[PDB]
Amino acid sequence: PSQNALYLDLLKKVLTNTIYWPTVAHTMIGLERLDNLQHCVEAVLADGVPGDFAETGVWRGGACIFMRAVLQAFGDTGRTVWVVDSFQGMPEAMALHEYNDVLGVSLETVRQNFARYGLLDEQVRFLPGWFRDTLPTAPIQELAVLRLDGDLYESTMDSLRNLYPKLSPGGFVIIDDYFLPSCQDAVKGFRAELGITEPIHDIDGTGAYWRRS
Amino acid sequence: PSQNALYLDLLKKVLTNTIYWPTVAHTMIGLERLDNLQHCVEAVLADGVPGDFAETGVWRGGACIFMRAVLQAFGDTGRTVWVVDSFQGMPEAMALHEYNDVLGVSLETVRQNFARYGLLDEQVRFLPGWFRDTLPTAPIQELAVLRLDGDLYESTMDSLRNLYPKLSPGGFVIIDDYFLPSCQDAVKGFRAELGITEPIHDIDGTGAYWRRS
Numbered sequence A, B: 001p002s003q004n005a006l007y008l009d010l011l012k013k014v015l016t017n018t019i020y021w022p023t024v025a026h027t028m029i030g031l032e033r034l035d036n037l038q039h040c041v042e043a044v045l046a047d048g049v050p051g052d053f054a055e056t057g058v059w060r061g062g063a064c065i066f067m068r069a070v071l072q073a074f075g076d077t078g079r080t081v082w083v084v085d086s087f088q089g090m091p092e093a094m095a096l097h098e099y100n101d102v103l104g105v106s107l108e109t110v111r112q113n114f115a116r117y118g119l120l121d122e123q124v125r126f127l128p129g130w131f132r133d134t135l136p137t138a139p140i141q142e143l144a145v146l147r148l149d150g151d152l153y154e155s156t157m158d159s160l161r162n163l164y165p166k167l168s169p170g171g172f173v174i175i176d177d178y179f180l181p182s183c184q185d186a187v188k189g190f191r192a193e194l195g196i197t198e199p200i201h202d203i204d205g206t207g208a209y210w211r212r213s
């Protein structure tokens, strides 16, 4: 219907730490991109799009916590949230990201973070490893929402190549850093190969998304 | 009915800062006493007890934010939350409390705190001053809930003497530090004068409360 709006509004403030790199916040994506995530998850639920949710690149887990919280707000107990990451930060330019591997947040730490919100339950599953190792054989069957938040070309490509085919029609692909060259080049390069023409919608001049036909 | 439970459960975690003297948390009273506050406010709303809510001794405002949030969760737009404090900390043993006047939190700071939760609106009113100055002529007409969280004898007495008479029947008096001698002596001394016999219920070995007949 549009349930538990107060809960979800407070949660966005909390996950971005507007109440008290973010320093302590559980997501780095900000309120505008969390609003996009809510719009997509809510649309999939109201439209009946089948499948799980997945984020490739979770850091402290905030965005994934949020998707799990939307399911909780709507009483959907069937869908799963896949929390997919190395849990060691970025792999070894490209833009030299491993330097800053306090993008490295352990599985233990992410698990604890979910538990802080009372959301560490059967509807959350973790897939630890480098995407190139883990996604070709991922135990994911179908997705209604696919969120990409690995910055690198390779991370973005490996996620799209392996998980886009599992995305249901009417499902969403969310590209958190579409305007990052590297991420952008993968998305266009991937779209060109498979002849994907669904239009890309801007979110906030950083992230972008599209909906499958 | 029992509305917005997820919201209120998250709020308690947030106000006590279990997500990320408390250091940054907006209340020092802990989850057990916030649960008591919710039980009392909810009972008053379901029973039809008329009146506003008031806390004498607010620090960073957390408990008052919570009462305002319960009204929000239940859609009650008529009741007011009175936020009553010096906004300069404790007055000048008794237990030498003014030493620690980083119990001193300005009105500006408390106002900002409410706004962080999106709850700084027409249903919240501030009464700045020493209780001995402000309560004898308080613009409060009736109360359904009266929360005392000034530690001192004088603070507790001044609050009871001036506000208890405005407490509706079936309304609650909450004593946050009943087991503090000073606070306790005022409560018993006040109860003995007016012949109040409604029994005191423990909350958590620290706070206590009773319900008016």
Ligand SMILES: Nc1ncnc2c1ncn2[C@@H]1O[C@H](CSCC[C@H](N)C(=O)O)[C@@H](O)[C@H]1O
Residues within 6 Å of the ligand: A026, A027, A028, A029, A055, A056, A057, A058, A059, A060, A061, A062, A063, A064, A084, A085, A086, A087, A088, A089, A090, A091, A103, A104, A105, A129, A130, A131, A132, A149, A150, A151, A152, A154, A155
């Ligand atoms: N090839 C790869 N394999 C596994 N994890 C990867 C990866 N490339 C990037 N990552 C992960 O991607 C994440 C980027 S940060 C994404 C975090 C953001 N707060 C959010 O709310 O999503 C890091 O956690 C990093 O470990």
Ligand SMILES: Nc1ncnc2c1ncn2[C@@H]1O[C@H](CSCC[C@H](N)C(=O)O)[C@@H](O)[C@H]1O
Residues within 6 Å of the ligand: B026, B027, B028, B029, B055, B056, B057, B058, B059, B060, B061, B062, B063, B064, B084, B085, B086, B087, B088, B089, B090, B091, B103, B104, B105, B129, B130, B131, B132, B149, B150, B151, B152, B154, B155
């Ligand atoms: N006589 C008095 N007049 C006005 N304020 C008083 C007072 N005696 C104590 N106070 C106030 O009482 C508060 C005690 S701390 C209460 C805070 C607690 N977190 C809560 O959530 O309620 C302080 O903010 C202090 O300024």
Ligand SMILES: [Mg+2]
Residues within 6 Å of the ligand: A149, A176, A177
């Ligand atoms: Mg990103």
Ligand SMILES: [Mg+2]
Residues within 6 Å of the ligand: B149, B176, B177
């Ligand atoms: Mg107290």
